[PDB]
Design a protein around this ligand. Structure first.
Ligand SMILES: CN(c1ccccc1)c1ccc2c(c1)CCC[C@H]2CNc1cnccc1C(=O)O
Ligand code: NI
Ligand SMILES: [Zn+2]
Length: 345
């Protein structure tokens, strides 16, 4: 993938069943270079029979997304509103006040998002704990992907909501997610259960540092008081700004029934087209371990997610454990490289 453009894959039912193995495969195809890949599941697979019995699902902490700024540079402040059900949410989303404007191509809707994101602030039903997968679905179950990320819970005994457990997100037109990589520069998996699309921007990991330098240059204050301020998930930057400042990036639109995968150190941002629900969690591979050792963490809030790397270094890099404990392991990540489990392909 030497254009490092976002790739789309259409696995057969038989490639689909082994999760970590399909991640290994898409990386043998270079999919990680772009930091984001789409995986369209085989036509007959479905995580759940239907979605008409969730109207009474509670969204404990929904957020109103106030955005402030100009000239394609913005800050998103996420204001916690009272508890509300899926029904109350859908009805707000589908109301004349919040529903999707007229468009006849993505590009038009993109211009409206960037022209209108600081007006009429939407509500996003984000960070809801739960899965919408039926108890019995065994393929790509966000609730139990069975990757090595599982050592945190199984060996360290630590539960981190949204990271090693699943989150649901109820979107409405113009709800957004700011530029970030995942906690600890993990992978993530994102499945759009139903509703209108979700659009994504990605920066290849091999160019992530340029995006940090851009953002640092634009938010010098933010940058002095924290080493990884983008991890606050409050910074929006338009594709025109990226283009203007020579930041390589791609876009893709995710439709209902499709997975998106983000890769370690893959910066992304994006917005929902209308009423929808996505499910997400983080996951790892062998390659991730080094990103975990090297990830640059929020130096400013007492609350942020940090995973102790010891369990992974003892198990998988036993030979380097003391070097590492001794600040002396200094491997350099080559972002172009597939995870070792890719060797078979
Ligand atoms: C600001 N913030 C905060 C973090 C720590 C402590 C206090 C606040 C925070 C944290 C998380 C989020 C938001 C805001 C804004 C809405 C969305 C989610 C991110 N959503 C995605 C991420 N990657 C990919 C896709 C999506 C998506 O929406 O589909
Ligand atoms: Ni993310
Ligand atoms: Zn911080």
């Amino acid at each position: 993938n030497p254009s490092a453009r976002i790739m789309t894959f259409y696995p057969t039912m038989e490639e689909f069943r082994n999760f970590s193995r399909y991640i290994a495969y898409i990386e043998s195809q270079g999919a990680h270079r772009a930091g984001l890949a789409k995986v369209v599941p085989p036509k007959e697979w479905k995580p759940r029979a239907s979605y008409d019995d969730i109207d009474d699902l509670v969204i404990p902490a929904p957020i109103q997304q106030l955005v402030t700024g100009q000239s394609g540079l913005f800050t998103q402040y996420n204001i916690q509103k009272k508890a509300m059900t899926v029904r109350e949410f859908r009805k707000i989303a589908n109301s004349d006040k919040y529903c999707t404007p007229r468009y006849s191509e993505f590009e038009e809707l993109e211009r409206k998002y960037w022209k209108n994101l600081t007006f009429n602030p939407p509500i996003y039903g984000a960070d809801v704990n739960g899965t919408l997968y039926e108890k019995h679905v065994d393929e790509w179950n966000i609730g139990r992907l069975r990757t090595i990320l599982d050592l945190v819970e199984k060996e360290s005994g630590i539960t981190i909501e949204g990271v090693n457990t699943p989150y649901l997100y109820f979107g409405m037109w113009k709800t957004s997610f700011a530029w970030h990589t995942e906690d600890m520069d993990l992978y993530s998996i994102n499945y759009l259960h139903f509703g209108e699309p979700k659009s994504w921007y990605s920066v290849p990991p091999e160019h992530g540092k340029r995006l940090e330098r851009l953002a640092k240059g634009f938010f010098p204050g933010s940058a002095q008081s924290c080493e990884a301020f983008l991890r606050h998930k409050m910074t929006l930057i338009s594709p025109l700004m990226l283009k203007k400042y020579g930041i390589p990036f791609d876009k893709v639109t995710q439709e209902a029934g499709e997975f998106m995968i983000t890769f370690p150190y893959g910066y992304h941002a994006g917005f929902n087209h209308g009423f929808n629900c996505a499910e997400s969690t983080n996951f790892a591979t062998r390659r991730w371990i080094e990103y975990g050792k090297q990830a640059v963490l929020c130096s400013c809030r007492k609350d942020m997610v940090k995973i102790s790397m010891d369990v992974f270094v003892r198990k998988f890099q036993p030979e380097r454990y003391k070097l590492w404990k001794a600040g002396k392991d200094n491997t350099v990540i080559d972002h172009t490289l597939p995870t070792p489990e890719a060797a078979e392909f």
